[PDB]
Amino acid sequence: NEVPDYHEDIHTYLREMEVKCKPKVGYMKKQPDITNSMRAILVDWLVEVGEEYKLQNETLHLAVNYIDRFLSSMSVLRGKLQLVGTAAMLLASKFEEIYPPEVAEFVYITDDTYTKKQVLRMEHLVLKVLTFDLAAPTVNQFLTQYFLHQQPANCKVESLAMFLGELSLIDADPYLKYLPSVIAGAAFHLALYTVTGQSWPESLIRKTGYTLESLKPCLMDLHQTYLKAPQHAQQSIREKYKNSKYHGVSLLNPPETLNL
Amino acid sequence: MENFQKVEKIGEGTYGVVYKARNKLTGEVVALKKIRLDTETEGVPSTAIREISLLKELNHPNIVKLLDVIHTENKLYLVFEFLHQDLKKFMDASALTGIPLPLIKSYLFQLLQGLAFCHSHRVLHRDLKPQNLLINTEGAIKLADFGLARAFGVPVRTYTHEVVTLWYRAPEILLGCKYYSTAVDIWSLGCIFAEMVTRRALFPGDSEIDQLFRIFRTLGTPDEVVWPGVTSMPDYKPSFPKWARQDFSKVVPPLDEDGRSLLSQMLHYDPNKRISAKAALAHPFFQDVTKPVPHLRL
Numbered sequence A: 001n002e003v004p005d006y007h008e009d010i011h012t013y014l015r016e017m018e019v020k021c022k023p024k025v026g027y028m029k030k031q032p033d034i035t036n037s038m039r040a041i042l043v044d045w046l047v048e049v050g051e052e053y054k055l056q057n058e059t060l061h062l063a064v065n066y067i068d069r070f071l072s073s074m075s076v077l078r079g080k081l082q083l084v085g086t087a088a089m090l091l092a093s094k095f096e097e098i099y100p101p102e103v104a105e106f107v108y109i110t111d112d113t114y115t116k117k118q119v120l121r122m123e124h125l126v127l128k129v130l131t132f133d134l135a136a137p138t139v140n141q142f143l144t145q146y147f148l149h150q151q152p153a154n155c156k157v158e159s160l161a162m163f164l165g166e167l168s169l170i171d172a173d174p175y176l177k178y179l180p181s182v183i184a185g186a187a188f189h190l191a192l193y194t195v196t197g198q199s200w201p202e203s204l205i206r207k208t209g210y211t212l213e214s215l216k217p218c219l220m221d222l223h224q225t226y227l228k229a230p231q232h233a234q235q236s237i238r239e240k241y242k243n244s245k246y247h248g249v250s251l252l253n254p255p256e257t258l259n260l
Numbered sequence B: 001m002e003n004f005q006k007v008e009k010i011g012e013g014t015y016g017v018v019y020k021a022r023n024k025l026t027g028e029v030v031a032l033k034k035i036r037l038d039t040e041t042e043g044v045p046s047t048a049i050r051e052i053s054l055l056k057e058l059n060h061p062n063i064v065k066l067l068d069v070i071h072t073e074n075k076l077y078l079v080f081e082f083l084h085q086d087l088k089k090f091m092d093a094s095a096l097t098g099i100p101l102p103l104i105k106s107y108l109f110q111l112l113q114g115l116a117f118c119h120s121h122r123v124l125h126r127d128l129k130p131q132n133l134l135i136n137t138e139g140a141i142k143l144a145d146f147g148l149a150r151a152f153g154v155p156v157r158t159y160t161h162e163v164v165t166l167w168y169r170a171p172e173i174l175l176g177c178k179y180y181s182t183a184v185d186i187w188s189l190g191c192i193f194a195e196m197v198t199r200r201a202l203f204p205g206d207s208e209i210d211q212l213f214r215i216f217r218t219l220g221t222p223d224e225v226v227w228p229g230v231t232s233m234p235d236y237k238p239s240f241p242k243w244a245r246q247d248f249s250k251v252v253p254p255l256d257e258d259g260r261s262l263l264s265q266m267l268h269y270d271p272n273k274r275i276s277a278k279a280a281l282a283h284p285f286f287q288d289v290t291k292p293v294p295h296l297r298l
């Protein structure tokens, strides 16, 4: 880390791992009792939990992976979707945070609709279903790798790309069909364009093999998501990124066209 | 869990007790990591979640293998490949006679390979120390105990309350740096490397400050020139004594040039210029490396 040596290896590896630790593109369809919308409401709620407990954005991206992964093979009734979500968050925390919140805290933030006993059992069930493979590559990770390729670093472009990638977590509707390395590529260029009129850098095209053209589809989707962002049913993420910690980038007016 | 027969306790633990067990059906000897679980009322531990998860991704001849994970009601057992003893015990037996340089080289070599594998798979060990390194009678040494291990897909924030061992802790962590880096692991091997050579612990500090001062006293007190940013770091102080760097031929006399060379690059102050596992493996110090067998007492 913080040394150019393994950066290339690590990238190549996360690329392999994202294919393996990826969910079922169309699992929501085969899920009898839950819908994208219920999910979007769930992820948004997790976003708030993250803020409330000052958790990392990685901890949020992971939990989302755990959830999608779980739902890709387990039928869940809406009445339990939150218990699943809570445990997933609990796990992501134990894995990524320096010191996760106590179980009691996760039972609390759910308005005691669930027992501490339930949380702990759902945790085991998730661990069993996920077969302990929790170290999943996130969009947040790929941005990190791409950020080294800036010239120089623009802490506003980053906060924006983070904002866009964090927005994708919400709508499974169009996003489950893109690999994190792709969503990240989209989020990066789109941010780079808005803030500095610059595009997907040649260094990255070579490092990722992705051409601006190849990111076009996801890009179109993300740009479109960026545009309607203010009128979305879920707003927790936008409220999060107008803060001065992220340079209120959620307030930057998106381009109207991308000229692609 | 019924097909296993416990033989003896081979290691205490705050994370869990380790037993040498035997598979009653296959004959395979294994090491069982038993986890409290029933207690804590906080579900599955983090060290367990991280050790299992990260280790399942690391398949290398120099990293102890995780064979299985048996989780149930109140008991969670980690099944690991077993090895005769750790390096701490070995260094002790070797006190009088000492470890031959060809074996020290062999061991360093393999360690750097196992570690290089961890790092290129975005895993930081963070707790490299003699008792966490295992060896067998055929000349193999392996990284073990990935409890404090961390995946660094994104930089790993440093604990406020120090967890890692003290004697092998890198100076960055002592000076209060924000993130860890693969560098902290190389520093540890660097310390282990000297210890094998001198038969003595390189920086045996009593406290965090005593630890920092022993490092300076030997490698000289760092400055802005040697390590840009030092003076600015959180726990750095201007009142720190200004010691001078000592000649490595007085720190580790039994080592040749390539030896003193590698060791100095492994104990390089600024963690951006400290040699990487990957790079060390290509150091001339290893041009004649072999795989000697050690002489181990039961």
Ligand SMILES: O=C1N=c2ccc3ncsc3c2=C1CNc1ccc(S(=O)(=O)Nc2ccccn2)cc1
Binding pocket: B009, B010, B011, B012, B018, B031, B033, B064, B080, B081, B082, B083, B084, B085, B086, B087, B088, B089, B090, B134, B144, B145, B146
């Ligand atoms: O063989 C092992 N496989 C392991 C996998 C994971 C792990 N995590 C922590 S320790 C450990 C593993 C071991 C331990 N092996 C080992 C074998 C013998 C010795 S020793 O003979 O040097 N010391 C002993 C022996 C008996 C009682 C106390 N200490 C030390 C470690």
